[PDB]
Design a protein around this ligand. Sequence first.
Ligand code: FES
Ligand SMILES: [K+]
Ligand SMILES: [K+]
Ligand SMILES: [Mg+2]
Ligand SMILES: [Mg+2]
Ligand SMILES: [Mg+2]
Ligand SMILES: [Mg+2]
Ligand SMILES: [Mg+2]
Ligand SMILES: [Zn+2]
Lengths: 52, 77, 50, 232, 190, 115, 109, 291, 164
Amino acid sequence: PYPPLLRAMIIAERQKNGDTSTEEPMLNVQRIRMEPWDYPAKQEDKGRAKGT
Amino acid sequence: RKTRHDPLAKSKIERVNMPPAVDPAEFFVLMERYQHYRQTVRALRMEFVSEVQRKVHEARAGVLAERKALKDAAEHR
Amino acid sequence: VRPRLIAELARRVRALREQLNRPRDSQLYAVDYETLTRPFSGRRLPVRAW
Amino acid sequence: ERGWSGNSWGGISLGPPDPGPCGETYEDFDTRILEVRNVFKSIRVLVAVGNGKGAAGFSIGKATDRMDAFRKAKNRAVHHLHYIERYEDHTIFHDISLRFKRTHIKMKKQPKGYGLRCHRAIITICRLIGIKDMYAKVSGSINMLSLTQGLFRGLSRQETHQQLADKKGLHVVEIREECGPLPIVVASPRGPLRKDPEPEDEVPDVKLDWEDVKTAQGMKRSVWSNLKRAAT
Amino acid sequence: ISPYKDEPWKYLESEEYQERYGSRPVWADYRRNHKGGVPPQRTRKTCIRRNKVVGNPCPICRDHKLHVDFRNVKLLEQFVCAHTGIIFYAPYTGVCVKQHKRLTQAIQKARDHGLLIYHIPQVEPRDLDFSTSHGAVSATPPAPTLVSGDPWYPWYNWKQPPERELSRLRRLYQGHLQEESGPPPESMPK
Amino acid sequence: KAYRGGHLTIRLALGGCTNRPFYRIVAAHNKCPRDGRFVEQLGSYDPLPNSHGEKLVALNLDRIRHWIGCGAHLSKPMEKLLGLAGFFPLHPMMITNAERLRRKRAREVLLASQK
Amino acid sequence: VRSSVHARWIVGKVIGTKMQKTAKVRVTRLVLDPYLLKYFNKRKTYFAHDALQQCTVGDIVLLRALPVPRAKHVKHELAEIVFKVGKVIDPVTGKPCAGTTYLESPLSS
Amino acid sequence: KKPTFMDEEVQSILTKMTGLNLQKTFKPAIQELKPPTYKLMTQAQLEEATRQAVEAAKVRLKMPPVLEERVPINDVLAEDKILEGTETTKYVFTDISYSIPHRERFIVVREPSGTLRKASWEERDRMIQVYFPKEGRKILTPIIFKEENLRTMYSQDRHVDVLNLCFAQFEPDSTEYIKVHHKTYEDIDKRGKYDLLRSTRYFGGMVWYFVNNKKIDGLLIDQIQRDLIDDATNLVQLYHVLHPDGQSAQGAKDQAAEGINLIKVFAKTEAQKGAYIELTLQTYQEALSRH
Amino acid sequence: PMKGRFPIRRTLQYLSQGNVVFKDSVKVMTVNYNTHGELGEGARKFVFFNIPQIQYKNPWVQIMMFKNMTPSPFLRFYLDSGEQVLVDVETKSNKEIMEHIRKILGKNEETLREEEEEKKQLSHPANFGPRKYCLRECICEVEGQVPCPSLVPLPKEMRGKYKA
RNA sequence: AUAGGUUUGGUCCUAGCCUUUCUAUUAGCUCUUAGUAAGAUUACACAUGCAAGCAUCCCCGUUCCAGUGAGUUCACCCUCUAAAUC
Ligand code: FES
Ligand SMILES: [K+]
Ligand SMILES: [K+]
Ligand SMILES: [Mg+2]
Ligand SMILES: [Mg+2]
Ligand SMILES: [Mg+2]
Ligand SMILES: [Mg+2]
Ligand SMILES: [Mg+2]
Ligand SMILES: [Zn+2]
């Protein structure tokens, strides 16, 4: 579901533009894959300690 | 604040930051809550990014913008 | 603008000396197991790793 | 009551003028001292009189004694009265710019409640005449006699709205911001009315004062302008 | 001690006031004492200092029967321009700062009580359209969770972790554990 | 001004007086001072209850959505405010702190009963 | 977007032709005096690429910005000659003129 | 259907009944003054200026719409019980996006119980004043609208000032607006002060209220006494169209009453003081004959 | 007094009376006019009275004047596209020339009103900040809210000195 | 500036200087309370203590914030286009 206020605003805009459909607004989350925090990162992009 | 060239204070050269103790049940529930909340917030952020890009595209080459461009070009003619 | 050439000279010399005096992994990631500190920098490892 | 200063004769009232040999009384007239000077000894006094209803005058008096000079000046002033036209009996009909000898005077008509923001002598003379709202600036040599003469001259040579209507044969219509777009006709020609409109001068060739334009544009910065002062 | 303290406006229609001031304002005859031709841009703070009047008290302070009250409308009118409705600044009438502040407050109170006439302009409406059909002011369709009594998201509620995960955490954090917490109270304890 | 790296973030800049805080919700570079230069003011937050017993929060939702869609980050207090407004989900820590406070009040009630 | 030169179109008078394929042009703009509130002419010199060497000192020319500068000071090119010096063609009628008098009468055509 | 207040026919009747007195419409305002300007004008130019002033007055006298009292807002967006007891004061969230009509603007309240609900009309008005302040409006209700201060204002015959303050402070569909306007109209009716509102934008609303509450007797009497017979006949006609199934409309249809006969029809059928209406009308007819 | 004939021309109010705001296409305006001849009189007036106003309203447009180079006065406008617009101005008064150029190359009132409405959005009334940019400095200026401690002391319970 | 004082035996003109107004610092004398704001003269020299960590090791941060006004048209707009966030 959308957050309450954002859902209310989406529905209000829909009714303002004449749409009267009753389907609930929904946030698609299938494309947001939650990667485990301990997944290996990109070592090529990591830095190195400077000599001193 | 100190710069990297400033020396470390002598009163904390023997300081160990001991990690805090964990409550396993609360820890696990909080981890799951952060996962779900971040998924939802990322979905919302993607939606807002799409709105911003769509508004920019409409401003440049939308039907209203192109109509107004043809209109004032004609009027000039 | 009066040229600032010493700055360029120093930048180039520093880059060369950093690329020629690179610390090696055996130096950077060595550890003293008694005190659990890096001898290269003297910084102690986090407790949760000890 | 004191005059313009504690030790100054200027601004002090001398009371009503004495009943004249013609037999007229002047109980409605007030007299004010404008200047007292030692003539090398005699005394020369410049005084002004006025009934507060447009009739006002001024005179010089020379005598060995101060009181004799006052009496002479007052009695001669009452017999040399100007009548000063007042718009709505509180202000002048239009802005008046004049130069008498080396003394320059700019006078500006003002709305009700503006008060007398004028040279102190001008404030005194205006109170004698009956003008209640006006702005005045005196430039050049501040000579008291020249100031008085120029003030009376300019105020006596002001054109009333009726005079302008008769001259131009047209309605004089007043526009007030507090009254909106309502046209108020203040004067109409006594004779016939011209059917051709005044030329709509796209840019009039008027002589502007840099002082007024500078104030209007906000480039005036004087620390002495628009200071709070007692009611006048 | 004034007999007009309870009804100050009485003093303005008493013969004593008429003899003292006539039809002119109570501040008409007052004059400040100062050096130079340009007066200081503020009046004195107060003419009465520790129950002692200064040598030249201001028009309000020089008369103890003049009471600055929001009901004394006629006295307040003397300190407002009749042609612009603007309260005179203190140097105009010579009133001290204390009495000027009191007069300003009394005038504002009189205007707020409808006792002193002031110009009330005619304004345009706030909105162009007066419709109330938008969802911001109308009823929004309830969400399924609101009808069902469930939380908006399932993770708003506490779910007991499996014992295997609790044991995994107990191994991960050996020697640095707190007492395990159970499900929280369903409502806020009173 | 060029900062090394950095990003835009929507955060709370503190104004007001001693013992009277007030907040402006602004989008600013993270490296900038707290009350310094900002890109846009996106709202305000008065944390002191007014005469009606209300904490007033103004949110420019259109501009907040714009700046989130342009890559701006959010500070934790701002995320919590947006969760309270219903614009975002309730932050996990509001839920966790509520549960902790419930448990603490339960312990206090149990102490009272035991006494 | 089409050019990095600030002045896209400018009109000026050719004041020099001593450089090869380059004309030195004087451009006047009207600048307000903040105090007097009167407009005064302010002059600026521009170098314009003139490939064909058709510019003569004193003629009024139009300069178009180059997409990028071709030299340190050459940022413009000669778009056209508005008024050739002493060979002015009246634009309203199209006929040659010498000052305020027609060399060829408009009625002749 | 029954005509609305904004119907063209009703609006024309009320506009002509209001009148247009330029002197009252553009009465000199007590404000900061500037030196007046002067123009030399011919007769034609003066007439053109007067016509432009008439058009400006017509714009100034535009009648505010008459609205029905707004229904209270009672809508819950969410019930987050987990938040219950975690806060002591409510949060008010106002969406301050610039380009939104104020009646389409989302304003919500998070209560200490954890309920996210929509703000009430009073809360909406206070918040909109807080963030979009309107000149003349106050966040806190002025005390002039209390009953005692309203009595004082009425005693000073400052009804138009009261209505201007009401229009500045309250929304047209708000309860306070309606109550104050109705109280002012009742005072005008009780004390016969109708002329106070003539040539103003509130006369139409007052007339509409009187017509819908069936108390046009005093206004009709005042119009007759002021020799505004066309206004009186139009008032009876508006009464008939607003009440077409009443005794007055039926009688006027029956005997084919027109003009003053409509007033006689109303006085005989549906007037609370028809006798005195008849007396005033008969006196007016005698005066007209004598003149 | 102010020097020169028609000193009103050198006042900001007159300079802001100008009603010609060129479209963005116009880059250069050349004004060819003649010093003598009745038929060019209006053009001369156009140079005397209206060029200052046009320049004031269009500071980035290059205006240049030419004298006695052609038998007839005329205006020429160079556009960014490369087009040239010629306007003959014999027998035309200065007011007529102004109206003509306003019609053919001037922004209409609708576009100007749109631009002012866009300018309005930049100054949001709800923002709090310095007087140079915002209506109010702080929320404490809003009635019903807690006022400044500078003007009204806070109760001891809300001050840290009495909480620590 | 609403101006005023002052050149002469005297009048007029010109012209400088000063007075009256509003701030800031310092000095003399004097000084009850509460709230708030602001607070080295010095780019002279500095005793002493603090001002940068975090984190299952890698990294990241310490290039920020805070300070000063010595030097002084690198600050603004347009074109182009890196690094950075998404
Ligand atoms: S300025 Fe807001 S509390 Fe003082
Ligand atoms: K780290
Ligand atoms: K410096
Ligand atoms: Mg003395
Ligand atoms: Mg001098
Ligand atoms: Mg001291
Ligand atoms: Mg600091
Ligand atoms: Mg990049
Ligand atoms: Zn006093």
